[PDB]
């Protein structure tokens, strides 16, 4: 259960949606094929339906250092990133709540185990920024 300042928060479930497929026109790297992959982020409401994650005004994907400019910023839902590469990796996704309410680091793993796969993560969100609280009402109780 919450304690102290963390009592004044609500939980929301985010869904990270990943897709990937081989690009045959790109030469394999050490016999490993290069794949196009994409990540998007949605919010789930109280019933489990996907809705735009408008509670974030920015998402930054912190990619493996083998990527050029590996910190990729997106400002509009669903914060879709598309890249290419030959290996999976853990990556932190920084999501920035509206009204400077806070950064959350969501641990993701980009991998090729399925053509597409979805992972849910629960984040705790404060209730002290009017515009964020009004936005939060779209996805459930506050």
Asked if 125 and 138 count as a contact pair (C-beta separation under 8 A), the reply is: no
Q: Which of 3, 7, 68, 113 binds another protein (CB under 8 A)?
A: 113
Q: Which of 10, 51, 86, 142 binds another protein (CB under 8 A)?
A: 86
- 70 contributes a contact to another protein by CB under 8 A: no
Choices 7-15, 79-87, 94-102, 125-133 (CB under 8 A): range interacting with another protein: 79-87
By beta-carbon proximity to another protein, the closer residue of 89 and 96 is 89
What letters, b where the CB count within 10 A reaches 16 and e where it falls short, cover 83-100? Answer: bebbebeebebbbbbbee
- 79 contributes a contact to another protein by CB under 8 A: no
By beta-carbon proximity to another protein, the closer residue of 5 and 31 is 31
Distance in angstroms (rounded) separating the CA atoms of residues 28 and 30? 6
Structure tokens at 135: 């936005």
For residue 24, the 8-state DSSP code is T
- 23 contributes a contact to another protein by CB under 8 A: no
Three-state DSSP class for residue 131: helix
By beta-carbon proximity to another protein, the closer residue of 61 and 112 is 112
Contacts of 78 (CB under 8 A, 6+ apart): 17, 40, 41, 42, 52, 53
Choices 6-14, 42-50, 84-92, 132-140 (CB under 8 A): range interacting with another protein: 84-92
């Amino acid at each position: 259960g919450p304690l102290g300042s963390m009592v004044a928060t609500v939980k929301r479930t985010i869904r990270i949606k990943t897709q990937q497929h081989i690009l045959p026109e790109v030469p394999p790297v050490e016999n490993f094929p290069v794949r196009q992959w994409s990540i998007e982020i949605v919010l789930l409401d109280d019933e489990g339906k996907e809705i735009p994650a408008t509670i974030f005004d920015k998402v930054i994907y912190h990619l493996h250092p083998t990527f050029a400019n590996p910190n990729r910023t997106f400002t509009d839902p669903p914060f879709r990133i598309e890249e290419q590469g030959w290996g999976g990796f853990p990556l932190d996704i920084s999501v920035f709540l509206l009204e400077k309410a806070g950064e959350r680091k969501i641990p993701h793993d980009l991998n090729f185990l399925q053509e597409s796969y979805e992972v849910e993560h629960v984040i705790q969100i404060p209730l002290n920024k009017p515009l964020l609280t009004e936005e939060l009402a779209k996805s459930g109780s506050t």
